[PDB]
Amino acid sequence: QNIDQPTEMTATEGAIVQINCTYQTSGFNGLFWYQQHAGEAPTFLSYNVLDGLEEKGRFSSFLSRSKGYSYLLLKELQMKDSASYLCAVKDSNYQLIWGAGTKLIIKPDIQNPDPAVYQLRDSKSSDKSVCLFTDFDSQTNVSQSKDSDVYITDKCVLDMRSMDFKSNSAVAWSNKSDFACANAFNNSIIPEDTFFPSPES
Amino acid sequence: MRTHSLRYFRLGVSDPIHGVPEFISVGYVDSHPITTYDSVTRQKEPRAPWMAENLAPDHWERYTQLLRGWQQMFKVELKRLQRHYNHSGSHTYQRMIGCELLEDGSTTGFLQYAYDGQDFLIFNKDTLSWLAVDNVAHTIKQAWEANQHELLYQKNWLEEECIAWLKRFLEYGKDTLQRTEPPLVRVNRKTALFCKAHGFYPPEIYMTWMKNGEEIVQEIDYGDILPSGDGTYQAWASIELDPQSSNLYSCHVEHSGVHMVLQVP
Amino acid sequence: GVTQTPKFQVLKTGQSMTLQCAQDMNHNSMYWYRQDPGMGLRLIYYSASEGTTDKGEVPNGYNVSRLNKREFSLRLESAAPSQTSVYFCASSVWTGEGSGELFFGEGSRLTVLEDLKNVFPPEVAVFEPSEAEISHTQKATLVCLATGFYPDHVELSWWVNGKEVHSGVCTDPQPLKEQPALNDSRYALSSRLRVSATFWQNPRNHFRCQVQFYGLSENDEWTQDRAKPVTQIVSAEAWGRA
Amino acid sequence: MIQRTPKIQVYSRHPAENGKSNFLNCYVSGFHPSDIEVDLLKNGERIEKVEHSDLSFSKDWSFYLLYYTEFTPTEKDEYACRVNHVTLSQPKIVKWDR
Ligand SMILES: O=C(O)CCNC(=O)c1cc(=O)[nH]c(=O)[nH]1
């Protein structure tokens, strides 16, 4: 018995995504979708057991028993839709067979990109120097460090709710003496127009 | 294939005598018991050799666990019914679910409940609704119909799962279920003519009397189809002789696509 | 709903542990799953009704007890590295309802280790905003770095003027392995808090990053020279700058 | 509340011929509720080695049962089936008619 769904999907804020689930099971007593935010409980989304499409707000779920497949359709994607989506099928013995889940990554719609690499202020309690790559469009990907003494985290989407403003950023740090924000992200393809403020005297 | 059916019954008894189980569930393919479970043994067991022969212990273990839970659910439902009927004493709750695969390949499916041996709720899988016989059933109908997914689960089980199980058991039991043993038929007189048939399988049989080539169903006493204990069946039909006028009577027997006539001289 | 504990637990190979789970939904059926990367949930044990249990797909190494209708505990008699996982308790009205969905607890992250020698709390530092960011964008991003911890059992929060905040925060969803090749690599985690330049420029605005670390307890044996890595909060602060 | 009294039919497995071994059947059917007592009688005396099927279920919600024993019929031996049910004031006895 086998349930299959893609490992990961990436789509843009405001668009549509279809998450597929195919199953080969011994008998069929229905298909479930659950949503699971990272670090949180899975919560029930939908149940299908006859053929066709069922809608529930922005989410629809479709089933074809003869093809052995279902999809979960998410319209007008929001950042809060970022989560894994788990498919599960009840077989002839009423056993739930779980798929491995599809992680859905949503790219924010960055309206006024202003890519820049800034040097944060040193902490008197730390030997680290810290660089922030921020405000780039979501097409940019941040690559891992190629120097074992330089640490670079992946891009993160932050939301300033009061200003209705979203921004991407990634952080790089090192205690190496030769470390400079000007070169911290040299292993990534960064925007041509990225702003590198002059370092102090 | 002739027509065949699969069905599961449940029986719950609210205040049983010391010996009696409070819950019993039996499955059948056609007239053949195939599975049993009750609240004394708390185990689901085969009632036909070709079920035990073809389902491994893992299957009986899993269904034993399912039946332990269905038993508790059945008690909870009965307790609710009797409280709402404002009935004291011992009362029964019954369920029957199953399907038929007809000779032409069409299918039927059914699900219904009884209280004290009388219809209580009847599922209509085409309109996805429950028929209620009284206002206690009507309250249940409203609660059950508010759970639309469970109605859909039941329709899929009746229409797809049940038919797949039935086809699987029909293959397991092929040498029993798909065989034909023709009837032995004789006419005697006790003044009535008795047309008597025995030795036949499957139990479906049609016996009637014709009087000068016309059938008078009002004049015919039809015996039941009865098990003989060896896996075959017996049956009879009778008509009373007119002592003033002779007539040309003939017994007619139809069984498994063969017709038989016994003209009485 | 469904309440399970503990949220995090580090264990030594051979140690015993009990996870607790309660539900206040008058459900009959309760379940214990494990969730592991690259595979679907796997059922360990369940309890169709008050006063019955039954095995699942992967019961070897585990036991359960249905204490009352509300509670269903999972015990690991002899913890093993392979039992490192996230455990989820769930419940449902009736196991035997066809269409019945599951209600899940929050999850319990267990890490089982051969020895507690590689357990480390995080060091936590806060970095004040770049002045170039402030003049270019009229916004100011603080960064919090929590580095060198193991296992990945941390919760990072920001506090502004004594209240926890979530608006304007982004914390890495996944920790960075500091030495990606090693199986026992210590972890790093970054978080950002972005506020307006005006808010950062108020000298009485106060900023703190706190990291709750889940580590060793009193009964855990400790023999290393460094400090015993107990469960603890590590934090760092910054004040606004006029 | 409707209770249904059992129908009681007594018959041999094969057409009876004195001296040839056979089976005596008592088929008890259409009754509700399910508790019932069934005895086969030889000359008014209960037979000891009596077998019976498990309680069976009809789609009309009534129950049925088959009791039987191996026997060799003779001219002098008179056989009967004795049934008690909540619908019956006293045991009902049905003789084998052949
Ligand atoms: O009813 C349903 O929702 C599903 C089908 N039921 C069964 O598989 C079943 C087995 C049995 O032994 N007895 C009984 O009543 N039912």
Author numbering:
A (entry chain G): 2 to 202
B (entry chain A): 0 to 189, 196 to 270
C (entry chain H): 3 to 244
D (entry chain B): 0 to 97
From the primary publication:
MR1 is a monomorphic major histocompatibility complex (MHC) class I-like molecule that presents ligands to Mucosal Associated Invariant T cells. Unlike MHC molecules, MR1 does not constitutively present antigens, but is found in the endoplasmic reticulum (ER) of all cells in a ligand-receptive conformation. Although previously described MR1 ligands facilitate translocation of ER-resident MR1 to the cell surface, we describe nonmicrobial ligands, DB28 and its ester analogue NV18.1, which retain MR1 in the ER in an immature ligand-receptive form and competitively inhibit stimulatory ligands.
To gain insight into the molecular basis underpinning MR1 down-regulation by DB28 and NV18.1, and despite the very low affinity of the interaction, as judged by SPR, we were able to crystallize the MAIT A-F7 TCR-MR1-DB28 and TCR-MR1-NV18.1 complexes, consistent with other structural reports with low-affinity ligands. As expected from their chemical compositions, neither DB28 nor NV18.1 forms a Schiff base with Lys43 of MR1; however, both ligands are clearly visible in the A′-pocket of MR1, as evidenced by unbiased omit maps of the ligands, indicating strong sequestering of the ligands within the MR1 antigen-binding cleft. Here, the carbonyl group of the uracil ring of both ligands is H-bonded to Lys43, which results in Lys43 being positioned closer to the ring structure when compared with that of 5-OP-RU bound to MR1. This tilted conformation of the ligands’ side-chains is supported by hydrophobic interactions with Ile96, Trp69, and Trp156 residues, and H-bonding with the Tyr152 of the MR1 α2-helix. Structural studies confirmed the ability of DB28 to bind within the MR1 A′ pocket, with an overall topology reminiscent of 5-OP-RU. Consistent with the absence of the ribityl tail and the lack of MAIT cell activation, both DB28 and NV-18.1 revealed extremely low binding to AF-7 TCR (KD = 172.0 ± 36.7 and 200.0 ± 64.0 μM, respectively), while we could not measure binding to TRBV6-4 TCR (KD = ND).
